[PDB]
Point group: C3
Chain length 124, copies 3
């Protein structure tokens, strides 16, 4: 018989950052930081609820637009002290982006109206 | 000053297809696709040249929205191999992008028995 | 309250191989090896000076055209004796290729007039 492996991921990701700040406060912050750092993009990075890896101390990042998703994985891996064997996946609107995509490209395609890009992370 | 030659070049014949007749395969694939419409049936086999272990079970049902990269960890934990060992997956002898979904690979590449065949190897 | 993470690369990279071997000699060698091994591609692999990881002993490789970037990463990591936790990225003309790209496709796109493909590697 077949062996079932893996589970679908619910699209129900809520972000503490969106819960803790009204829209216009977020938009004002995102607009101002895009003016101050025009070669970076503001990204909210938060743990998916079924993730079985560590928490991030900070959620609000400023990442160079020209860095790839792959480069960003390593920078985040280092902050959650992941063992090399441990998985790490980013999801934007519940979809894992290609590792060769740049953060600027992802931001242009998927930032919200508050000027933030939202990324959930998980080990599965 | 001399060139250093490394790596080896790579169609694979899956022993599963020799072990089970086509019509029994197809009947099963059609049945399981109706039973689990949000999963895809996959046959996973080791490439003969791989120096890592074989899987006990070959037949898996994976969520269509799962990626190859996610699938990698679900299968790697079921193989006997060392941390130092590589693991690569092939569909029709090509390594897919890690962000490709299993449902997309199934839609493009499932055979006429409605299974997706995936090989794995080390390096 | 933003956390700056990662740095942009300014794209500066020279290859010691080119400094040390005249163009005409490089071109004749690359032409000759492509005739003899038509299913392999000649690659020069060098560490970016800014990288804080180990250097390679050998820089001139001859790899199957159908080998992927991912397969080549695994071999080069081993040759450098990289810690599992350290990152390794390849750059071709300052762009990280997709891990599923083949070396033959990168060679076709980016080999120079000496018939070599030049790859830099770094930890970031």
């Amino acid at each position: 018989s077949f062996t079932l492996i893996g589970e679908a991921s619910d699209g129900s990701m809520k972000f503490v950052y969106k819960e803790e700040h009204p829209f216009e406060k977020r938009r004002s912050e995102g607009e101002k930081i895009r003016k101050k750092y025009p070669d970076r993009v503001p990204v909210i990075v938060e743990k998916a609820p079924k993730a079985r890896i560590g928490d991030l101390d900070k959620k609000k990042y400023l990442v160079p637009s020209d860095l790839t998703v792959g480069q960003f994985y390593f920078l985040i891996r280092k902050r959650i002290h992941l063992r090399a064997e441990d998985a790490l996946f980013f999801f934007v609107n519940n979809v894992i982006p290609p590792t060769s995509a740049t953060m600027g490209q992802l931001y242009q395609e998927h930032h919200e109206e508050d000027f933030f890009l939202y990324i959930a992370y998980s080990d599965e």
